[PDB]
Amino acid sequence: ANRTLIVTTILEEPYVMYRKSDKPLYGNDRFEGYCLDLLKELSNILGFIYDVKLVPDGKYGAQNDKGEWNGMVKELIDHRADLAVAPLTITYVREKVIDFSKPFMTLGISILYRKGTPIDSADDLAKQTKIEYGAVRDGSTMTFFKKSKISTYEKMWAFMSSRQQTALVRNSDEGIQRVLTTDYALLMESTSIEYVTQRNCNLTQIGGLIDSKGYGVGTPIGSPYRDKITIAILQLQEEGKLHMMKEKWWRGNGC
Numbered sequence: 450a451n452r453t454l455i456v457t458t459i460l461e462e463p464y465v466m467y468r469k470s471d472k473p474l475y476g477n478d479r480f481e482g483y484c485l486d487l488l489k490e491l492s493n494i495l496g497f498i499y500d501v502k503l504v505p506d507g508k509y510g511a512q513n514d515k516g517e518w519n520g521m522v523k524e525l526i527d528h529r530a531d532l533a534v535a536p537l538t539i540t541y542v543r544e545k546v547i548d549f550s551k552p553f554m555t556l557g558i559s560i561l562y563r564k565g566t567p568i569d570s571a572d573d574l575a576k577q578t579k580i581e582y583g584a585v586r587d588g589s590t591m592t593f594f595k596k597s598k599i600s601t602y603e604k605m606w607a608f609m610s611s612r613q614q615t616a617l618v619r620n621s622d623e624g625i626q627r628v629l630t631t632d633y634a635l636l637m638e639s640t641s642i643e644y645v646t647q648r649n650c651n652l653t654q655i656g657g658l659i660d661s662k663g664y665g666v667g668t669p670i671g672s673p674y675r676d677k678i679t680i681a682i683l684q685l686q687e688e689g690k691l692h693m694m695k696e697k698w699w700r701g702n703g704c
């Protein structure tokens with residue numbers, strides 16, 4: 450029997466969650482969600498077995514000032530995982546050090562905030578300071594602002610970087626709690642926003658998509674699996690299964 454593939458991933462609802470059960474759950478059975486369903490479908494098309502591991506440091510992957518990567522990106526670089534199957538955003542900087550399949554889901558950065566305010570866009574956030582705003586620290590969303598050369602986004606980065614102790618948050622759930630408990634707007638991927646707004650009728654996406662990208666399966670550079678995974682994703686798309694999986698996890702279940 451050929452080798453079990455090691456898959457790195459990260460807890461992020463709905464994509465990867467701990468399954469709830471009365472019975473004890475072991476190994477891969479402990480996890481459920483969109484990415485686990487995807488991984489199952491991929492393994493069925495491509496004929497591999499796998500072992501799901503969380504990224505040890507609990508991070509997506511960013512570069513430090515020395516250029517060193519961490520998170521799921523580093524696990525792939527260092528060949529401690531064969532695949533990353535997660536809501537891992539395909540970015541030019543990451544493409545330099547790891548390979549990605551074609552996307553299995555598209556998204557754009559946008560804004561999560563409450564309904565019923567005069568805030569209609571990023572520009573409306575940028576031109577004021579009363580409403581705090583920010584992003585999950587050290588992910589592709591935060592990095593977008595850090596690296597932007599667009600006036601509005603530079604101003605927003607200046608704001609959230611100078612006010613970093615309160616404006617930048619640890620993870621999605623912490624950001625959502627800030628939106629819920631304080632006057633705060635979270636810069637967040639549209640996929641996640643949709644999940645939230647389906648579950649809290651006081652919350653809304655503000656404005657449109659600030660960028661346009663995708664999540665892809667990551668592999669170490671040069672992996673022969675990357676193209677096979679692309680082909681499998683294309684098949685799932687052709688079969689309508691990617692649409693089915695999104696519907697399943699975003700609007701029923703639940704919740």
Ligand SMILES: CN[C@H]1[C@H]2O[C@@](C[C@H](N)C(=O)O)(C(=O)O)C[C@H]2OC[C@H]1O
Pocket residue numbers: 461509510536537538539585587588589590591620621636637638639641
């Ligand atoms: C999967 N989406 C969520 C998560 O995506 C991240 C990580 C990003 N998907 C990445 O691959 O670095 C982001 O930066 O938007 C961190 C966290 O932020 C809130 C929301 O966008």
